[PDB]
Symmetry: D2
Subunit: 225 residues, 4 copies
């Protein structure tokens, strides 16, 4: 049960983050939802920014004493071709998508983990769970997804060395790679957009299933782009 | 899962026994198949067409319609391609491939036919097929050619199967387990898996409609 | 000295061509010298490998290109997929290459290492269906998926004797229409010689081991 | 043949880029060697800076007339734990490794590809080949390799969307994931040794010649799993 477990949810104001936050709250969990702007406490923070990350962790210690969970859902999925009519893909645009998607989730990991590390382990020796949001684009990059695919491919790659290291402290790191979700016909089955709640239902299952660790789980109705 | 009819392979022990246990406790009805006795149990050779056919008739008559198939029939033998004795016996590779791959496919093609004829639930779903590969399919070690190749063919089966079966609202998902205690080096949890953990992933797969066509490693982050 | 499986046509025939040009000795096997053999059969394969040892005195290479790539649904108009058809595809594609691997490896076992310590190189033909199985390719995907998974345990064991094991997963080749149009680049069918060319890159580059290499023009089915 | 073809190579001063530049020179190719420090024409460039990268492409457009080939070999490979004795992994250190390994290769790719774009197709219809250098850590990330692994995982994941877009113009994009090489061992199954940079170069060459190789990541690692 997640009851009285303290989770940090990133991208918490909408989409996958909102749905995870909601799921945790229904399970009696305690949540710090973090996002750039406003839609269980909510704080504003740029996950990319060191000082904002630090201050949200300091808010967590001070309000709650412990952190047992981190769910990285802050994310941007722009579309932009490597060679546009206009000229080449903006460099800034690519660096920014990498900064939000990859650097931000790493930033939340290095700092959340420091804290989970200090808490009481459970019966299995578990101290913490970290879940990240990659995307199916990490494996099936479509035209115009270069930045996005590279970004989420970095997240997907990060899972295993993070799992191997944090195993020491009994912290799990698992990554979900979602397909198309109804968030702010092609799909073999079910032939429809994923509902955020289905994403959250997998998140909770990772939280509960101690043997899931170091893996990237495709959640995509068998879609291949 | 309550009042749903599931067929489970390798049901007399290990993963399959834990899956039958999980299902029954969820109020589902289970036809557990295995070669030898340990919810009804019936003897069957998952490999044999006629035998698999008869098992599916028993289920059609007896319980009426089939919702679920969990392939947990397998063998995990170990044999060098080149031994002091000589090269790896051919019979032996073929038997491992018969039980793991050919037996899984057989159970899929016949369970699928029956699910095909059933009525779709609230999401349009007519059945779920969960397959047991192995982390050997990606991390084969010395000694594991037969098992690795055999489980690797089950893994690759997943997607063409889900793609076709989508037509009928049948999902196909494969799990790739690591080391489970069935009949030290693991990163975390630094222990063998309990079979019950495998059954709980299967149950989550049953519950989560968006899981389809995927191979899910369940192995405490172990790379062999 | 090379044994090439499925050497009568397709990719096997181009592989025999390429080694023939390179001035190697080839034993072509199929249902430079040919020899009629069933890759599946424990006897034919032994007799084949015994042929090769007395007639040739060593074995340095094995290229498995014996294959069937047939099409059939899991639920057909008529009924379920035939079990024997499925078993037969697994047999040719997977049992047959394993049969050839266990035997050729026994011989390459007993030969002289070169300057890199290499006694042998085995190249297997998987397929992209092993990762992108399209509807109707369950048997094909399953068996070629078996091949692909074999590569690493096999390379890890055979490392002992300096035998490398590499698998190629080709996309669409003109071997025995605009499906071609759908391959991103080059937008055509692959030529068997290009396949043979990678077999050659692999025989040449000692660091390629234990890998499945896509040769598919960026195609995803 | 690589004869008369013009290549840009990145991290050209040592290790893998050096050996690539060597093999291209020996096959009679014109080579633009980019790197930060010196040991075919060499220029000093930061593959990460937009203006350095634009200045290198203009240079090679004016100087040689075309660009047919980009080989990305610039890269760093720090090890730092997520949670170290001192404290958590520095933020900016992680960014910096992502910036050299990932933002760097993308910068070169977007700019080279623009130029390759503007040339004539060769006999196979090919205007370019881009080979990237990822690493086995993209799939087998070891302890301490988080930043390196994510970086290279980025590079690996880029390859298919790039080949898919750039197919339109006949530019192939292929990524090699090398294992342990002798660049600035009883563990590798066979050969039980560090790879020589020449063997990396030889795969780069195989890729330039083989038109069917596109959108893929090739492990070049002697079957090592980290």
């Amino acid at each position: 049960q997640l009851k009285s477990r303290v989770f940090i949810v990133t991208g918490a104001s909408s989409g996958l983050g909102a749905a995870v936050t909601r799921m945790l709250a229904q399970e009696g969990a305690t949540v710090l939802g973090l996002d750039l702007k406003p839609p269980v406490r909510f704080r504003n923070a740029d996950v990319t920014n060191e000082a904002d990350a630090t201050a949200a962790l300091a808010f967590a210690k001070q309000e709650f004493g412990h952190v047992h969970g981190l769910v990285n859902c802050a994310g941007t999925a722009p579309g932009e071709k490597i060679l546009g009519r206009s000229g080449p893909h903006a460099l800034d645009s690519f660096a920014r998508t990498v900064a939000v998607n990859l650097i931000g989730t790493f930033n939340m990991i290095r700092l959340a983990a420091e804290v989970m590390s200090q808490g009481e382990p459970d019966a299995d020796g578990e101290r913490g769970v970290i879940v990240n949001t990659a995307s199916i684009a990490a494996f099936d990059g479509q035209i115009g997804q270069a930045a996005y695919a590279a970004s989420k491919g970095g997240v997907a790659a990060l899972t295993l060395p993070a799992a191997r290291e944090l195993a020491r402290f009994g912290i799990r790191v698992v990554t979900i790679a979602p397909g198309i979700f109804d968030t702010p016909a092609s799909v073999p089955f079910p032939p429809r957009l994923g509902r955020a709640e289905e994403y959250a239902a997998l998140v909770k299952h990772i939280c509960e299933n101690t043997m899931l660790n170091g893996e990237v789980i495709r959640l995509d109705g068998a879609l291949r782009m």
